[PDB]
Ligand binder design. Structure first.
Ligand code: HEM
Ligand code: K2B
Length: 395
C-alpha cells in the first residue's frame, strides 16, 4: 500500500502518483490514505458517487479541510441549479462558437509576441495567458488587468496543500483579500452602470426572488475566474507536451486538421487539470467495498479515473484518435463543468495556431522531465521551454 497523503500537494507533483493510482484501482478502489482520507479511484466509483448527490453532497465544500463557501459548486440542488441557470446561456456550444474570432485573435496576438524570438516558455507565454484573456473578457477584466488577476489566481491555488508553509498560507490569504477588495468595488460599479459582462449579469440576478448577497457575488465571480484561468492552461501545456514527446501524434495532427476534436479530448483525459473534488457523505454507507461515515469527505480522483484500464485500453498511451474517450476531466452529473465547451474551443484554436505558425516546435531537451506544481487541487506543468524557427508576426 502506497504511503501517501492525498491532501499533500507534493503527491500530485510527484510522477509516482499514477503508480499509486494503479494500486488503488487494483486493491482498494475506494482508497484511504495514511491519514484516513477516503478517495474514489476507479471510473466506476467516481461515476456512482456523482450519480448520488443526495448521498455524496457538495454542500460541505469541494476541498478537504475547508468549509463550504457561497458559490454554486459548494451547493446542492435546488439551490445550485437556480444559480447555474443564471449564467447557463452564455456557455452553450452555440454561444461559445460565436467567440471563435475573438479567441483566435488572442491566440495570434500571443504568438506574435514570441514568433520572432524562436524560443519561449510555452506555459508562461502561451498556455497561461490565453484562457486568462478569454474568461477575463467575459468577467469584465481589462486587458491591462489580466496579469494581475492571474497573479492572484496563481496565489489562490498554487499553495493548496496539507504541507503549506506559514508564509505560503499568508500569500494565499493576501491574494484573496486583494481580489476581494477589487471585486467588491467592481460589483457596486456594475450596479450603478450595468454592462455586458458576467459580473453585471450576477449583480442584477435574482433567486426566488431576492438578489444575491455581496459575499456570494464575490465567490461566484471567483468560481468562474479560477475555473477559467487555472484549468485550461494545464491541458494546453501538458497536452502539447504529449504531442512533442510523441511526434508521430504531432505529425498525424499536422497533416489532418479534422483530427483536432479527438486530439483535444485526449489532451483533456491525459492532463486532467482538476486532480480531485470532494463530496461530503450525508449518511453512513458501504461504497464499493469501503465503509464511509456520515460527515466525512471523500475525494473524486479524476486523473485516476481517466487512466482506469477498465474503461481505457492502454491508458498510458497518448492517442489523439482514441474513440470512445468518455474521460472525466470535466466531471459528471449536476456539477459537470460549466465551461467545458469554452475550454474545448480555447484548446482547439490555440493548438491549431501552434501547429500552423510553430510547425517545427520542439522541447528544448526531450530527455529532461518537466516539474509539476505541488498543489492538491489543480496542477500542471510549471514551465515548458520550447524552441522553433522564427517567423514574422501577423499583426
Ligand atoms: C480543461 C479545462 C477545465 C477543466 C478540466 C474543468 C474541470 C471542472 C470540474 C472537474 C468541475 C467539477 C465537476 C464535478 O465535480 O463533477 C468543474 C466545474 C465547473 N467549472 Fe470547469 N473545468 C475547466 C474549465 C472551465 C472553464 C473555462 C470555466 C469558465 C467559466 C469553468 C467553470 C466551471 C464552473 C462554474 C464549474 C461549477 C459548475 C457547477 O457546480 O455546476 N471551468 N470544472
Ligand atoms: C471550477 C474549479 C476550478 C473551482 C474553483 C474553486 C475556487 C474558486 C476555490 C477552491 C479553493 C478556494 C480557496 C480555499 C482557501 C481559502 C480560504 C479562505 O479562508 C479564503 C478563501 C480561500 C482562499 C478559497 C478561495 C476560493 C477557492 C480558490
Amino acid at each position: 500500500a502506497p504511503d501517501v497523503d492525498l491532501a499533500d500537494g507534493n503527491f500530485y507533483a510527484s510522477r509516482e502518483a499514477r503508480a499509486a493510482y494503479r494500486w488503488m484501482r487494483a486493491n482498494q478502489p475506494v482508497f484511504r490514505d495514511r491519514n484516513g482520507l477516503a478517495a474514489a479511484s476507479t471510473y466506476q466509483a467516481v461515476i456512482d458517487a456523482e450519480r448520488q448527490p443526495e448521498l455524496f453532497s457538495n454542500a460541505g465544500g469541494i476541498r478537504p479541510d475547508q468549509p463550504a463557501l457561497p458559490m454554486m459548486i459548494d451547493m446542492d440542488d435546488p439551490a445550485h441549479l437556480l444559480r447555474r441557470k443564471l449564467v447557463n446561456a452564455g456557455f452553450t456550444r452555440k454561444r461559445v462558437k460565436d467567440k471563435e474570432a475573438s479567441i483566435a485573435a488572442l491566440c495570434d496576438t500571443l504568438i506574435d509576441a514570441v514568433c520572432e524570438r524562436g524560443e519561449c516558455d510555452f506555459v508562461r507565454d502561451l498556455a497561461a495567458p490565453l484562457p486568462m484573456a478569454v474568461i477575463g473578457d467575459m468577467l469584465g477584466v481589462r486587458p491591462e488587468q489580466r496579469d494581475m488577476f492571474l497573479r492572484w489566481s496563481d496565489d489562490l491555488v498554487t499553495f493548496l496543500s496539507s504541507h503549506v508553509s506559514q508564509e505560503d498560507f499568508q500569500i494565499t490569504m493576501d491574494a484573496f483579500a486583494a481580489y476581494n477588495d477589487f471585486t467588491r468595488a467592481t460589483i457596486a460599479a456594475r450596479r450603478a452602470d450595468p454592462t455586458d459582462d458576467l459580473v453585471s449579469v450576477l449583480v442584477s440576478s435574482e433567486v426566488d426572488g431576492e438578489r444575491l448577497s455581496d459575499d456570494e457575488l464575490v465567490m461566484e465571480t471567483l468560481l468562474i475566474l479560477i475555473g477559467g484561468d487555472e484549468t485550461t492552461r494545464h491541458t494546453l501545456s501538458g497536452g502539447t507536451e504529449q504531442l512533442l514527446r510523441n511526434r508521430d501524434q504531432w505529425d498525424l495532427l499536422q497533416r489532418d486538421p479534422s483530427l483536432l476534436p479527438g486530439a483535444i479530448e485526449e489532451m483533456l483525459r491525459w492532463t486532467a487539470p482538476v486532480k480531485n473534488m470532494c463530496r461530503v457523505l450525508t449518511a453512513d454507507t458501504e461504497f464499493h467495498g469501503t465503509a464511509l461515515c456520515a460527515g466525512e469527505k471523500m475525494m473524486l480522483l479524476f486523473e485516476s479515473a481517466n487512466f482506469d484500464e477498465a474503461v481505457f485500453c492502454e491508458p498510458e498511451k497518448f492517442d489523439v484518435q482514441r474513440n470512445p474517450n468518455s474521460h472525466l476531466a470535466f466531471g459528471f452529473g449536476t456539477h459537470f463543468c460549466l465551461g467545458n465547451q469554452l475550454a474545448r474551443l480555447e484548446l482547439s484554436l490555440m493548438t491549431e495556431r501552434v501547429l500552423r505558425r510553430l510547425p517545427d516546435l520542439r522541447l528544448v531537451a526531450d530527455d529532461s522531465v518537466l516539474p509539476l506544481r505541488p498543489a492538491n487541487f489543480v496542477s500542471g506543468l510549471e514551465s515548458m521551454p520550447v524552441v522553433f524557427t522564427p517567423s514574422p508576426p501577423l499583426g
